């Protein structure tokens, strides 16, 4: 871990990735895949299996599977500081539904009705249900305050 | 000296490995402008964490000359103009951050502080209240806001901070610095609360960097320069170079220094 | 004083090896999403062993054999809890009978998967925890072939 | 407590470091020209507390130009700092094997043997070093500290004599006067402030002085006071002082003691 | 504060910190070479010849041969502001050296060859005339 | 002189000068030069005058002219521990205190009353009786 911490640090520090571009690579590839609760393949996927799989394949970032657990990763983000690659969370029978912000008030998610899609945050259903956001892509800091 | 002290932090082996390697890579000619600017930015950050601010600023400046769209560069340039006492050039640098990236939240803080030190307390409050409501449970957001509201009126700056404290979830350890400033707890009590929370030496050094700055400001507000000069020095002696508390402890000492002449 | 606890040699090889994950990920930046094609070696399509062979060649100058069967015979056997970035990780596919990827720490590896092309995956994905077999350290601290 | 502003990297150091990078990155330095530059960057990295980097530069210089006692010196010190005393003695041997005229090896190896507990051999080296400049108080202080392990009362009279047999000019003779019981800790600190001019001068005084008071307190088994006095030595950030280097070492030793 | 020097002040210090090194590298080679009026080789050199050679070899800067013409190069400087690499001029003909800081200068003297002198040597103090800055 | 300091530092740390051989360049150039009290030219020079021009021209170090001041430059050195480029000194006779420069092997170089600038042995018995002190004037300060 004392090599692997340096190596992990070095990777975060050199890698300047185009976050939106990478998310849309994944979306192009996964567009229209069906809803299956607990699924995580191209035969069917739920919202948080989609997030988990996206951040791993595209950013090498290890997120938990549970949406409860995904809602406590990284720092919370107010709505006006929203950036591409932030997890957007909604009160939506789960209680809790997660997508990825991709700018222009759009987000990418696995929905019940349509499978993997882009929606607008402004769509009445989601604006009522918008709950919070989390930043999980985040250059990790040298010294920490208490 | 019968008091609470850490081993002043030393460069970590990781920092030196990464600097040693960066130097090898930057010496190569197998780098795009884009990947070079990136190494320069990230070496700048590293140099800044070791307190080598002239070298960091030098790398940042070179990163920007290659990739202009770097709000993170302008943020650091702003910070360094603040530490230099060039508040006017600093306001302008943070202006730039938020033109480039309106979401670059931390420049509200950093320009808040630059305005504070520049004697622009009303404008500072504008930025530090903005910062505060982006994360209420960050105690340092409320602490900087208190500092800026303080000069306008001490009395309702404390009633506001009390408000922030009660409104917060009160987890993070820094709410103790707040509790002291309210007069909830003694300075004695703050120092044992501190040691309790602090695990290893690095943790201890972070706790003492942040805390001795806020105690320094408390004593300075009372007109005790002797006590404040000491608490600013013990803050810096932790060598947590990239803390705002560390940087501005240095500025206060510079201001205290220049008062003391003639 | 405890960057000095590491000897000048340990330091020398930390500097040499600190960028090894970023080099594998440099390969991933360019090869990400490339299809599986058995016997293939290009961005038209590539198998697990070809992706591994090409990565070690381009990133580190390390010649490895073509087939998965020759690769797993390379270097030195590694137990699960001693895995290090750059280690080959071997699974039983049963498409040929043998499947290989590169460990990048934190329970993840890169590989040309049969289903999803070149991707990152977890060693804890049920599918791959069940079929894990062994691990090979083929890259030495000095970036030579690792001794047997 | 009397405090300086912890020393910060100077403009001169950062300017020179920046330039030295450009020069070393260029491909027109003879081996010798590069060796001396690596050595010199090494010194500068060391003066900023960047000892792995320093040691890395020193090690590369030696690779190019093997006849460098100045490098073996530092290397030896870094081994002392790391608790690696046997490897250190060996490094310092190399110094005198190349240049027997290199006084500072006697000191550094002197101190390495001190921390290695080979107190006779350390008295040999530190008395050798004393004899070059009887008037350097620090030579008399290190000698005393080494002799103190075997007989503190005798170490104390041979230090009294080292005092009278000297000019009594350089400030550090006040440290010695305190060790002798001639002045209190308070008087020593009054003089410290009186003698210091700017902050850099004050930091230098507090770095050396709080090491020596740290060792005084150790010698009475007061680990609390020693620990604090060592940290306040290190806090001045005079990274290339003997008293700084081995303040860190003491703290490390106290660190392992407590934490068991 | 190190950071009171601006970024441009810093870039400039970095560009110029080796300027004395380079004059002294010239001196290391040229040290103790004979005087000879009209000489430009290592067998014997004059004052203007040594200066011309230094600026050529060290600064890639081609100055004229004669002392007359070297007085007209760059811009004027007063004693207060002398920097390393500045031409210092004396009445002696007249005479050309290169300031290296701390009241000393390098030059081919008619008596002792290529040497370092102090500006405060009485001979040279009363014969100081002007200085020229010629580095961009 | 924020600049000139750095320039001065850089020149110091970059130069790895050969002390013995630069002195011997001087002595090459100056050997046989007549004695002249208070002189400082190739037409005549005394022993401190020679020291002053040697350290100036060969090292850019500025020494005072007074032989009394020259012996309170640097720091004192015991005769055991002599290194090339140390000032050696000798008790005043009828041309003042005497000062030369050590060139190793018990040999110094000096302007002499009798022979001009020449190399001498410390072990010549005139100079063993007259020997007095040495000074080293070549190379964060402890307090």
Numbering used by the authors:
A (entry chain G): 22 to 113, 115 to 168
B (entry chain A): 26 to 287
C (entry chain I): 21 to 168
D (entry chain B): 28 to 287
E (entry chain E): 22 to 113, 117 to 160
F (entry chain J): 22 to 160, 165 to 168
Give verbatim excerpts from the published study on this entry:
During cell growth, PG endopeptidases cleave the crosslinks of the fully closed sacculi, allowing for the incorporation of new glycan strands and expansion of the peptidoglycan mesh. Outer-membrane-anchored NlpI associates with hydrolases and synthases near PG synthesis complexes, facilitating spatially close PG hydrolysis. The protein level of MepS is known to be regulated by the periplasmic PDZ-protease Prc (or tsp, tail-specific protease) in complex with the adaptor NlpI42. The structure of NlpI in complex with MepS provides molecular insight into NlpI-interacting endopeptidase colocalization, while the Prc-NlpI-MepS complex elucidates the molecular mechanism of NlpI-mediated MepS degradation by the tail-specific protease Prc.
To characterize the basis of how the lipoprotein NlpI mediated the endopeptidase colocalization near the outer membrane, we determined a 2.8 Å resolution structure of NlpI in complex with mMepS by X-ray crystallography. The structure revealed a heterohexameric complex with a homodimer of NlpI bound to four mMepS molecules. Moreover, the SAXS profile of NlpI-mMepS is consistent with the crystallographic results, with χ2 = 1.73, confirming that the hexameric structure does exist in solution. Surprisingly, the intrinsically disordered N-terminal of monomeric mMepS becomes folded and dimerized upon NlpI binding, thereby guiding four mMepS to form two asymmetric dimers bound to a homodimeric NlpI (namely NlpI and NlpI’). One protomer (mMepS-1) of NlpI-bound mMepS has the extended α1 (residues Q28 to W51), while the 12-residue segment comprising Q28 to D39 lacks a defined secondary structure in its apo state. This segment simultaneously engages in extensive interactions with the h1 of NlpI and the h3’ of NlpI’ located at the dimerization interface of NlpI, thus contributing to the extension of α1 by approximate 3.3 turns and 18 Å. The core structure of mMepS-1 mainly interacts with that of mMepS-2, while the extended α1 of mMepS-1 engages the interface of NlpI dimer. Notably, mMepS-2 of the complex structure simultaneously engages mMepS-1 and one protomer NlpI but not the other NlpI’. We conclude that the colocalization of four mMepS molecules can be mediated by a NlpI homodimer, suggesting that multiple mMepS may work cooperatively and thus enhance the avidity of mMepS-PG interaction.
